[PDB]
Design an enzyme around this catalytic site. Sequence first.
Site, PDB file in Angstrom:
ATOM      1  CG  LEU B  50      54.707  -0.048  12.525  1.00 29.60           C
ATOM      2  CD1 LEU B  50      55.004   0.213  14.021  1.00 29.60           C
ATOM      3  CD2 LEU B  50      54.672   1.252  11.764  1.00 29.60           C
ATOM      4  CE1 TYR B  51      61.393  -7.480   9.665  1.00 27.29           C
ATOM      5  CE2 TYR B  51      59.833  -8.027   7.951  1.00 27.29           C
ATOM      6  CZ  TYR B  51      61.077  -8.155   8.514  1.00 27.29           C
ATOM      7  OH  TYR B  51      62.028  -8.963   7.926  1.00 27.29           O
ATOM      8  CG  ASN B  52      55.658  -6.540   6.058  1.00 26.85           C
ATOM      9  OD1 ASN B  52      56.665  -7.204   5.946  1.00 26.85           O
ATOM     10  ND2 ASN B  52      54.483  -7.058   6.362  1.00 26.85           N
TER      11      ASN B  52
END
Lengths: 134, 140
Positions: B50-52
């Site tokens: 999700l960060y990416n």
Amino acid sequence: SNPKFENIAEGLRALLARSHVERTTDEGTWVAGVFVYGGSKTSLYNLRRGTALAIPQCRLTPLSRLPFGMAPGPGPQPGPLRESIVCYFMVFLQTHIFAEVLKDAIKDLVMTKPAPTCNIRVTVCSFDDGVDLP
Amino acid sequence: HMGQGGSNPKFENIAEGLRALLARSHVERTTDEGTWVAGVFVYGGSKTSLYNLRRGTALAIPQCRLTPLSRLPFGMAPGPGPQPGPLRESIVCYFMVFLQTHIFAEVLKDAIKDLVMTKPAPTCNIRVTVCSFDDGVDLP
Ligand SMILES: Cc1onc(NC(=O)CSCC(=O)O)c1Br
Ligand SMILES: O=C(O)c1ccccc1-n1cccc1
């Protein structure tokens, strides 16, 4: 033992008692919600604790932070990841009809309180495909 | 573009993949009213995936606004904790994208679904739904 959170719960319950709409469905899917923001971090946190006590049928995110909107003028717009100091939390619900009732109850509750509590804002939200909470 | 050693960061590759998919849809992303009335709600996968995706979405789409990563509560039958059931936090993360148009939220939801299906687990386990805000969100 948490009189602050219990007093908010009681205020919400008194307002929600005026309605008898369904809070759950046989499907059990999380298809609506209330998006609560502004005020202050602490006032939102307190409201979240009271909401949890008043509404066993809901689910709550932690508090988090809102990004900025549009900037007036011709200067640069904020990047999409920029975070403001304004916080929010989400209430997940199984019925839209109860989301509307809860939105009205939160609005009515916070307008009777001094700043910054009375600056809390709320909107109903809907999830097209639901949210598969784990 | 190609970074040092023939590699790009995952979030840059996400941005490029999203740009390619979104180029297929010539839909309005902004309104005269400028109100934040739509969104996409993105969750699951893993915190790193999700960060990416969040960083790549920001790079691909200047017209949107994103929350930080945060955590979802449980649905039916929450796990244990000293506090009321509605407050208990799972290990599943989410973020939200705010948008000015309903049609672009739909297009972005479809683009994310199409993109993550091409990635290995856990990225392909990311879930997304469009959302709408009845009264808008007055972002600061
Ligand atoms: C930001 C922010 O402001 N209050 C918060 N707390 C909760 O929502 C529930 S407790 C977990 C914790 O505080 O780390 C958070 Br996250
Ligand atoms: O603690 C708060 O800021 C608060 C939040 C939501 C509703 C009522 C509140 N309140 C304020 C004074 C007594 C209750």
